[PDB]
Design a binder for these strands. Structure first.
Ligand SMILES: Cc1cn([C@H]2C=C[C@@H](COP(=O)(O)OP(=O)(O)OP(=O)(O)O)O2)c(=O)[nH]c1=O
Ligand SMILES: [Mg+2]
Ligand SMILES: [Mg+2]
Lengths: 555, 412
DNA sequence: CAGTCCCTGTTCGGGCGCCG
DNA sequence: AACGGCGCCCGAACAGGGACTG
């Protein structure tokens, strides 16, 4: 006979055709034994845990770990086998709140529900599926087995049930206090208002007593009444916010798992520290698949790591969101496919920063990557503030106009303005739209044998110029690119090039300025040196123009 | 007082589990206000995290409308109940709707809120309202009545709809009425004054039983086709003929009688691209014959009601967008071109969005199906902006392609 | 006409950061 | 040695289209 808590229960079922967990316990140290027998006895008197007998043919091992910055221990249940047989839940936590999205509030209070999961009940018909034994001695007393009447920590349904139960309890209080903002993330509650400090504490105590009606306690241990508030890993001040101190390891010998932690903290630091790069550091995590393998730092990875540490020396901070002012996002090119950006409302008062350095596609250009950076910033801004910022981009309006009007794919950038901060983003060459009068016409082609991997590439021109180059360990696609490279090498500043390669033409028409292929990069270098290039395509094996003639040479 | 029509998913398929995407501030504030009223009216109810199903939701404004409309992306739930709105209770498509002079589209989705939904099926209509900056967890609901945007709603309401439209159809035997999703397509050959008058009579016929006041007008008799055309120049260069033979060779996949023998003979040798080549007597004959074949209709091209419709779109530049609707490759049921749409010369995504909506509207009128689109755009570009410009209450399927223009086939 | 290859794209799962 | 959320950068597995070979 246990009392039913005021919180409405959540009906939890299991996957059909499956039963409950039947896993043997794990032999643990005697230190954990004297730290769980006292918990199951206290929770038994408080109605949070009931004792069972032989009528419960289930069992689940448990373990305990020390809480961070607290004398109290934390109890966890290894429900990994129960999660495989429990119904799937749709998570109501859609993201992580960011302090740059917080508005200016006169008074701020951060609460913390004590015994979060241990205050929300479990489904009545589901408590039987949570069986676990607790031996008081490591090899003497068999230990009476208990069960759970609340949410266990470690179960895959505990977070979603708590987050949904907490919302239903706060819904009536928020309806009575519309002007009070309550950021609800797990058990921690961020409460802010524009009321006076005296009147603010009055509503805080009203909320503390409101939650107490459902058995939710807000102890004075984690009650924050004055800045700086530690919320979501940040330091919240009345007019600014900053990330909690980030410590980077400094080892003499670096391994794989050390760089993974190093790059991770730099990603977390790049949200407010402008100009952080992890290109050369992450480049060391390629190929090697041994987390305990020493990797020497390259000169590029060492200079990148040195510049990041100096950025973290000077203390930086972000500001809060003012809906009355516009959102501004400015991007800078950092080179090697690296982009950094700042989002702000007042000049030099950054709400947050960030970086985009994803390299998608074997061939691309700075305009494509700038477009991808804008899209990432847009979605990020819609998550945090619910609107798109006005962009300040290092690309001329004329350059952008030339690109998107002539590109075959739909592409667009929201309302933006040009900012003249080098390096400017530009197109490094422009393919002509019509054939060039007076320019030598090169008919290029390439063929390769599938078996021997041998091939040829060359050209014939209207002036009689001709070349055939034998190639070893190549492909049909490479010889077509090689043929175009030959025509660019052996032509004047203006040249018309005729190819039948849909592959090669498709790459070059997209005006790439960088490539994972050394051959394409050489072609790009030649295209930049030219003054006029016209690429034309004809179908292969049709007796068209000189394409038929060069086809005989390379095949 | 209405027995809930039992609805079952297709055998071997679970409910939809699609993540909600971020919403702008004005859309969240619109959906919160709409869902609060619907919950007060009992149309929807809040649910918990024990419902593992979810469907995206956002809000739109129709053309020239300042009122928000709740739009649910039921595309996943629809194709998981396909044997219902197509096999059990299907709606016949009238072939005469596309022949009418004027066709008005009426939003009748609000009538579906009067019929209850099967209790065992309400769990599949779950959606989640997000919050700005994740201030609060997601606010989950499920539908208690027939939801807008679900293909099962017009199927179940069809029995009720027929009784309502029965007196009007007897009054006007020449008017063709077709129902698709939340819309009602009303076509007639009457004059513009007579047509709009009869549309208002149908509106009053529905009132005696929030977007019924709107009426998007169509004119399928004015819809045009964009055939393949060949350039007509006074002089031809090597480059011109090389492009012509490449275009005709690709066109041979559609018209088998197209020849390029006499035209390829003009390119014998290794000539400069800008060299002017006069057309021989046989080349003029072969080019003139190919122009007539492009006017002839393609053999063995007809609509198969059991096959899906496919729509490809090409960005031609300067506000020009071409498209082809087909079920089998090179068997185009329709080819057209759009020009100077909204967003022309400034926004590719708004134009592409408009083109997709226009093509879908045509496909609903002609065949009663929405095609699956092959969009010439990057996935991330489309998924960032398309909801900003969507003005329809349905959503077609789409995929993303990248085909460089080796030869301008549909627009020289 | 199939069956491959070459090439390039997306998807996903795990590594890390961080929150509770 | 547990659960859920989000972000990044990584690689293996998979899909799809031109193009060549039997
Ligand atoms: C940090 C953490 C948390 N949780 C779950 C459990 C309760 C909520 C909040 O955890 P908590 O605030 O740190 O501890 P809590 O149970 O609330 O008890 P108190 O320390 O607040 O008194 O999230 C978890 O399952 N694993 C974890 O590692
Ligand atoms: Mg707590
Ligand atoms: Mg070739």
């Amino acid at each position: 006979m246990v009392p039913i808590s005021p919180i409405e229960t959540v009906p939890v079922k299991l996957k059909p055709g499956m039963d409950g967990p039947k896993v043997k316990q794990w032999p643990l140290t005697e230190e954990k034994i004297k730290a769980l027998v006292e918990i199951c006895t206290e929770m038994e008197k408080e109605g949070k845990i009931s004792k069972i007998g032989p009528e419960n043919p289930y069992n689940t091992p448990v373990f305990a770990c020390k809480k961070k910055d607290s004398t109290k221990w934390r109890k966890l249940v290894d429900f990994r086998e129960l999660n495989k047989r429990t119904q799937d839940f749709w998570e109501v936590q859609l993201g992580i709140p960011h302090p740059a999205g917080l508005k200016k509030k006169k008074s701020v209070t951060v609460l913390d529900v004590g015994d979060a999961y241990f205050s929300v009940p479990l489904d009545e018909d589901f408590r039987k599926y949570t069986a676990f034994t607790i031996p008081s001695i490591n090899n003497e007393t068999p230990g009476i087995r208990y069960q759970y009447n609340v949410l266990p920590q470690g179960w895959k349904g505990s977070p979603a049930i708590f987050q949904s139960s907490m919302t239903k309890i706060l819904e009536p209080f928020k309806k009575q206090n519309p002007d009070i903002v309550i950021y609800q993330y797990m058990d921690d509650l961020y409460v802010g208002s524009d009321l006076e400090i005296g009147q603010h504490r009055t509503k805080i105590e009203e909320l503390r007593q409101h939650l107490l009606r459902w058995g939710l306690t807000t102890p004075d241990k984690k009650h924050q009444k004055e800045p700086p508030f530690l919320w979501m890993g940040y330091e919240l001040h009345p007019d600014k916010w900053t990330v909690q101190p980030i410590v980077l390891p400094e080892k003499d010998s670096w391994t794989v798992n050390d760089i993974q932690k190093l790059v991770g903290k730099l990603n977390w630091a790049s949200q407010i520290y402008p100009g952080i790069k992890v290109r050369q550091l992450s480049k060391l995590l390629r190929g090697t698949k041994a987390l305990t393998e020493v990797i020497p730092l390259t000169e590029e990875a060492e200079l990148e790591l040195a510049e990041n540490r100096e950025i973290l020396k000077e203390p930086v901070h972000g500001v809060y969101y003012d809906p009355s002012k516009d959102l501004i996002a400015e991007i800078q090119k950092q080179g090697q496919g690296q982009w950094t950006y700042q989002i702000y409302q007042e000049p030099f008062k950054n709400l947050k920063t960030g970086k985009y350095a994803r390299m998608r596609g074997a061939h691309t250009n700075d305009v494509k990557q700038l477009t991808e950076a804008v899209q990432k910033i847009t979605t990020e801004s819609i998550v945090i503030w619910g609107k798109t910022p006005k962009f300040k981009l290092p690309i001329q309006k004329e350059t952008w106009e030339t690109w998107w009007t002539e590109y075959w794919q739909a592409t667009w950038i929201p309302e933006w303005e040009f900012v003249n901060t080098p390096p400017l983003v530009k197109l490094w060459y422009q393919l002509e739209k019509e054939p060039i009068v007076g320019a030598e016409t090169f008919y290029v082609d390439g063929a390769a044998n599938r078996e021997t991997k041998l091939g040829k590439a060359g050209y014939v021109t209207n002036k009689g110029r001709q070349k055939v180059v034998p190639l070893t360990n190549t492909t049909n696609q490479k010889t077509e690119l090689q043929a175009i490279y030959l025509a660019l090498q052996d032509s004047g500043l203006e040249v018309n090039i005729v190819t039948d390669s849909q592959y090669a033409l498709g790459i070059i028409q997209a005006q790439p300025d960088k490539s994972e292929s050394e051959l394409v990069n050489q072609i790009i270098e030649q295209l930049i040196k030219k003054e006029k290039v016209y690429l034309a395509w004809v179908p292969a094996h049709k007796g068209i123009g000189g394409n038929e003639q060069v086809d005989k040479l390379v095949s | 007082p209405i027995e809930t029509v039992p609805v079952k998913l297709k055998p071997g398929m679970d409910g939809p589990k699609v993540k909600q995407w971020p919403l702008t501030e004005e859309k969240i504030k619109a959906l919160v206000e709409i869902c609060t009223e619907m919950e007060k009216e009992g149309k929807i109810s809040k649910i918990g995290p024990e419902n593992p199903y979810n469907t995206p939701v956002f809000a739109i404004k129709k053309k020239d409308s300042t009122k928000w409309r709740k739009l649910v992306d039921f595309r996943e739930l629809n194709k998981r109940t396909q044997d219902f709105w197509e096999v059990q209770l299907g709606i016949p498509h009238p072939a005469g709707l596309k022949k009418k002079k004027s066709v008005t589209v009426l939003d009748v989705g609000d009538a579906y809120f009067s019929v209850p939904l099967d209790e065992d099926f309400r769990k599949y209509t779950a959606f989640t309202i997000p919050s700005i900056n994740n201030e609060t967890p997601g606010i989950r609901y499920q539908y208690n009545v027939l939801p807008q945007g679900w293909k099962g709603s017009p199927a179940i309401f069809q029995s009720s709809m027929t009784k309502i439209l029965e007196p009007f159809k007897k009054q006007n035997p020449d008017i063709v009425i077709y129902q698709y999703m939340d819309d009602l397509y009303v076509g007639s050959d009457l004059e513009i004054g007579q047509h709009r008058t009869k549309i208002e009579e149908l509106r009053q016929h529905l009132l005696r039983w929030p977007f019924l006041w709107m009426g998007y007008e169509l004119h399928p008799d004015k819809w045009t086709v964009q055939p393949i055309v060949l350039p007509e120049k006074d002089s031809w260069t090597v480059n011109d003929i090389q492009k012509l033979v490449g275009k005709l060779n690709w066109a041979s996949q559609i018209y088998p009688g197209i020849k390029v023998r006499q035209l390829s003979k003009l390119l014998r040798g290794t000539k400069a691209l800008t060299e002017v080549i006069p057309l021989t007597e046989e080349a003029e004959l072969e080019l003139a014959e190919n122009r007539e074949i492009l006017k002839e209709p393609v053999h063995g091209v007809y609509y198969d009601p059991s096959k899906d419709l496919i729509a490809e779109i090409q960005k031609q530049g300067q506000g020009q967008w071409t498209y082809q609707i087909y079920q089998e490759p090179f068997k185009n049921l329709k080819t057209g071109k759009y020009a100077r749409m909204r967003g022309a010369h400034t926004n590719d995504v708004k134009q592409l969005t408009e083109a997709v909506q226009k093509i879908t509207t045509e496909s609903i009128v002609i065949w009663g199906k929405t095609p699956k689109f092959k969009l010439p755009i990057q996935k991330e570009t489309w998924e960032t902006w398309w909801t900003e410009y969507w003005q329809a209450t349905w959503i077609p399927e789409w995929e993303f392609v990248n085909t460089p223009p080796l030869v301008k086939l549909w627009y020289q």
